[PDB]
From a paper:
Na+/H+ exchangers that perform this task are physiological homodimers, and whilst the ion transporting domain is highly conserved, their dimerization differs. The transporter is made up of two distinct domains, a dimerization domain and an ion-transporting (core) domain. Here, we report cryo-EM structures of [name] [name] and E. caballus [name] in complex with cardiolipin and phosphatidylinositol-3,5-bisphosphate PI(3,5)P2 lipids binding at their respective dimer interfaces.
Following sample preparation optimization, a data set of 14,329 movies was collected and a cryo-EM map at 3.3 Å resolution was calculated, according to the gold-standard Fourier shell correlation (FSC) 0.143 criterion. Similar to previous [name] crystal structures, the cryo-EM structure of [name] adopts the inward-facing conformation. The cryo-EM structure of [name] is of the retained physiological homodimer. One CDL lipid (CDL 1) was located in the middle of the positively-charged part of the dimerization interface, flanked by two additional CDL lipids (CDL 2) bound at the ends of the dimer interface. Additional hydrogen bonds are contributed by T205 and W258 to oxygen atoms of the CDL 1 phosphoester bonds. Here we could structurally confirm that CDL binds between the [name] protomers and it is there stabilised by interactions with arginine residues. The structure of [name] in complex with CDL supports the proposed regulatory switch induced by salt-stress in [name].
Residue numbers in the entry:
A (entry chain A), B (entry chain B): 11 to 382
The structure:
C-alpha cells in the first residue's frame, strides 16, 4: 500500500556510490569477506559474513512469504480447483519462456549454464511500490494477481533449485532435521496456539541445516507452513504474526540487504554489457521472456472454458502487469549469488550489472505505459 | 501467583541423579566442557558452552528483574517520598550480617576470600512458590515485601560485584558500550513506543561486552531500565513485555538453568562439607546470618520512627519471612560460578554442595515454622 520502495532505491544508490571514489578500499572489499569460523569440538563451520547475513535475512523473508501463502491458500483466492487457474497458468508461463530464452545462447558453457534460474525470480516490494504512485487507478484485482503470481513463481524457483543440483549434506544434519519437522506436525496436530514454541523449533531446524545453502532459506517457508491459522476465540496467531512482521520486512529486512549485495565496481565496464552470453541472457530473459511468457499463456487460459479473466480487469492490464513482473532486483541478485557461490567475482559482478540494467529498463518501460 | 517450583525441584533432582549416576556422568561432565571458539579474523572469543548458556539465561532474567524494578519504583511499593524505608533497611541488613559471618572463617585464606557475596544472593521464584504452596490465607503484604527485598538484595550484590574487583575491558568495547547507552537515552527522550528497537540495541550492547559475564548480565538490567513505561492511549510497552516474558522465565529459563548448574558429584563426600572454611562460612551466612540480620535491622527500623510496619505484619511473620529469604539456591549457585571461574572444580563443587544443603535446611525450617 504505502510507497516504501523509495527506501530501497535510496539504499541501492547509497551502496552503489559508497563503493567508489575514496571508499571501497578501507571497507566494503576487505569487509563483507572476512572469514568467520564457529567451532564446537569436532564440529566446525567456516563461512563469509555476507553468507550469514543473506541466510538470516532470506530466512526471515521466506518465513513471511510462507505465512502469506498459508493465509492466501485457504482464505480468499486459491481456494478451489478453478479459483486459482489464472495465477497458476501465469506462473507456469513465467517458469518456461524466460528460462528457455535465457538458455538459448548460454547453455553451451556449463559454468554459466548453471545459472538457468536467474531471470525467473520476481521482486515483491518494488512492483507494489511502483503501483503505489498511481492515484486511485489501481484496482485490487491487479494487486492480488501480481502478488499471488510473483509469490508462486519465487516459491517454485526456490523449490526446484533446492531439489536438484544440490550438495549432499551430512546425514546427521538430516537425522535431526527429520525429527524437528515431525515434532512440529505432532505439536500442531494437538494444538499449540503459541508462536514462541514454533519459532524456537524453527530456529533449531534452521541451525540444523545452516551448513548448506538454500535449505536454510527454505526452513523459513517450512516453518511458516505449520503455524496454526484457524480462527478461534477472536484471535489468530498467523494474522498477528503477519501484522507484527510486515513493518520490519519493508523497513529493515529488504533494506540493509540491497545495501550489501547490490553494488558493482563499475570501473572497467566496456562494450556496455560486453555483449557476452550471461549478461545478454539475463537482460533478454527478464525484459522479453517474462512479459511475453506470461501474456501468451494467460491468453491460452483465457480461452473458452478454462480460466476466466478477473472482474474489473482486461487483457491490457494483464499485459502491463506482465511487463512489471519482469523485475527481479534484490531477489534475482540473491538467486544469482546463491547459484554462483565459490566463483571468481567477475561472473557475479557481471550478473549483478545485467540484473540492475534489466530491472531499471523494465521498470521505466512499465511506468511509461500506465497512460502516464 | 501460580504454585510452580515443582518444575525447578524436578529439574534439580533430575540433574543430580544424572550427574551422580553410574553410567551418565561420563557424558554429563564432558558435554559441559566442550570449548567454543568464534572469530572474525580478529577478537577471538573462546569459552565453555556453560558460560554462554549462563550468560544468555541470566541476561534474560535480569532484563525481567530490571523491568520489574522500573515498574515498582515509580508506581509500586517503592513509590517515593522515602516512604519505602522498610525494604531498603532490610536490604542493608541483609548485605552486612550474612557477609560478615562468611568472612569470619575465610578472612585469612586469599583464594576463597573472593566469593564473599555468595550468601547475600537470594532466590525469588523458589521462595515465592514455597509461600504460594500455603496460599490460602497469606497476606499480599508479605509477598510484595519478600519480592522487593530479594530483588533489591540481588541488584545490590550484582552491582557491587560488577563495579569492584573486576577485570578491565578493551578500549573499543567500552567505546561501543558508551554509544549504545547514549543512543538508548536519546531514543527514550524523543519517544519510541516500539520494543523491537530497544531489544535490538540491547542485543548490540550485550554482544559488545560479551567478554565478561557480569557486564553481560548488567546489559539486561540497563535495557529493562530504559524501556518506556508511561501510560498512554490505554497501553504500555513495559507491562505487555512483562506479561509476555513472565511465563517463559518460570517455565523454560529457570528449570533449564537449574538442570545445567546443579550437577554435583556425591563421590567420596566425608564429614559433610569436610568441616572446611568455605562451606561452613556459606552455611553460616545463608542460614543464621540472613534471618538474624533481617530481624535485627527491622527492629532498629521500627525503634527510631524510621519506618512503620505494613498492614497485617505485627513483626511475628517477619522472622519467618527472613528465614524464607535466607535461600540462595539458583542465584547463589550462579554467583559462586561467576566468582570462582577458571578454578579447580573441587572448590566450586564444595560451594555448590554447601549452598544446596543450606537452601534445603532453610526451606524446611521456614515451612515448619509457618505452623503447617
Ligand atoms: C509444549 C508446550 C506448549 C504449551 C503451551 O501452551 O505453552 C506453555 C508455555 C507458555 O505458554 P502460555 O502462554 O503460558 O500458554 C498459553 C496457551 O495459549 C495455551 O495453549 P495450550 O497448549 O494450553 O492449549 C490448550 C490445550 C488443550 O489441548 C488439550 O490437551 C485439551 C485437554 C487439556 C486441556 C484442559 C483440560 O492444549 C494443550 O496443552 C495440548 C498439548 C500441548 C502440546 C503437547 O510455553 C513455553 O514457553 C514453554 C517453553 C517451551 C518448551 C519447548
Ligand atoms: C529510529 C526508528 C524507530 C521509529 C519507530 O517507531 O520505528 C519504526 C519501525 C516500525 O515501527 P512502527 O510501529 O511502524 O512505528 C510506530 C510506533 O508505533 C510509534 O513510533 P513513532 O515513530 O510513531 O514515534 C512517535 C513519533 C511522533 O512524534 C513526532 O515526532 C511526531 C512526528 C510527526 C509530527 C509532525 C512532523 O515520535 C518520533 O518521531 C520519534 C522518532 C524516533 C527517533 C528519532 O521500526 C523498525 O522496525 C525500524 C528498525 C530500524 C532501527 C534499527
Ligand atoms: C527464551 C526466550 C523466549 C522468550 C520470549 O521473548 O518469547 C516471546 C515470544 C512469545 O510470542 P508472543 O507472546 O506472541 O510475543 C509477541 C511479540 O513479542 C510482540 O511483538 P512486539 O511488536 O510487541 O515487539 C516488537 C518485536 C517485533 O519485531 C520482531 O518480531 C522482529 C522480527 C525480526 C526482524 C529483525 C531482525 O520485536 C522483537 O521481536 C525484537 C527484535 C528481534 C530481535 C532483534 O517468543 C519469541 O519471541 C520466541 C523466541 C525464541 C527464539 C530465541
Amino acid at each position: 500500500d504505502a510507497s516504501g520502495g523509495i527506501i530501497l532505491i535510496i539504499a541501492a544508490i547509497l551502496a552503489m556510490i559508497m563503493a567508489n571514489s575514496g571508499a571501497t578500499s578501507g571497507w566494503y572489499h576487505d569487509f563483507l569477506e572476512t572469514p568467520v569460523q564457529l567451532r564446537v569440538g569436532s564440529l566446525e563451520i567456516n563461512k563469509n559474513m555476507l553468507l550469514w547475513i543473506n541466510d538470516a535475512l532470506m530466512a526471515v523473508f521466506f518465513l513471511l512469504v510462507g505465512l502469506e501463502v498459508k493465509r492466501e491458500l485457504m482464505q480468499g483466492s486459491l481456494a478451489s480447483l478453478r479459483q486459482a487457474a489464472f495465477p497458476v497458468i501465469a506462473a507456469i508461463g513465467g517458469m518456461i519462456v524466460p528460462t528457455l530464452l535465457y538458455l538459448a545462447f548460454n547453455y553451451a558453457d556449463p559454468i554459466t549454464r548453471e545459472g538457468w534460474a536467474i531471470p525467473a525470480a520476481t521482486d515483491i516490494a518494488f512492483a507494489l511500490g511502483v503501483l503505489a504512485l498511481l492515484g486511485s487507478r489501481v484496482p485490487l484485482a491487479l494487486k492480488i494477481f501480481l502478488m499471488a503470481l510473483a509469490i508462486i513463481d519465487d516459491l517454485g524457483a526456490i523449490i526446484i533449485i533446492a531439489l536438484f543440483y544440490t550438495n549432499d549434506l551430512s546425514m546427521a544434519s538430516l537425522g535431526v532435521a527429520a525429527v524437528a519437522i515431525a515434532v512440529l506436525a505432532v505439536l500442531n496436530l494437538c494444538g499449540a496456539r503459541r508462536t514462541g514454541v514454533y519459532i524456537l523449533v524453527g530456529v533449531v531446524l534452521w541451525t540444523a541445516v545452516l551448513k548448506s545453502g538454500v535449505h536454510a532459506t527454505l526452513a523459513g517457508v517450512i516453518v511458516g507452513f505449520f503455524i496454526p491459522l484457524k480462527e478461534k476465540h477472536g484471535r489468530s496467531p498467523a494474522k498477528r504474526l503477519e501484522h507484527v512482521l510486515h513493518p520490519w520486512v519493508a523497513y529493515l529486512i529488504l533494506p540493509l540487504f540491497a545495501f550489501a549485495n547490490a553494488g558493482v565496481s563499475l570501473g572497467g565496464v566496456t562494450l556496455d554489457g560486453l555483449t557476452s552470453i550471461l549478461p545478454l541472457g539475463i537482460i533478454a530473459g527478464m525484459l522479453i521472456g517474462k512479459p511475453l511468457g506470461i501474456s501468451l499463456f494467460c491468453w491460452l487460459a483465457l480461452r473458452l472454458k478454462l480460466a476466466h479473466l478477473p472482474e474489473g480487469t482486461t487483457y491490457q492490464q494483464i499485459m502491463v502487469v506482465g511487463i512489471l513482473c519482469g523485475i527481479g532486483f534484490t531477489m534475482s541478485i540473491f538467486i544469482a549469488s546463491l547459484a554462483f557461490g565459490s566463483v571468481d567475482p567477475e561472473l557475479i559482478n557481471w550478473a549483478k550489472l545485467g540484473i540492475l540494467v534489466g530491472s531499471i529498463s523494465s521498470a521505466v518501460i512499465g511506468y511509461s505505459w500506465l497512460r502516464v
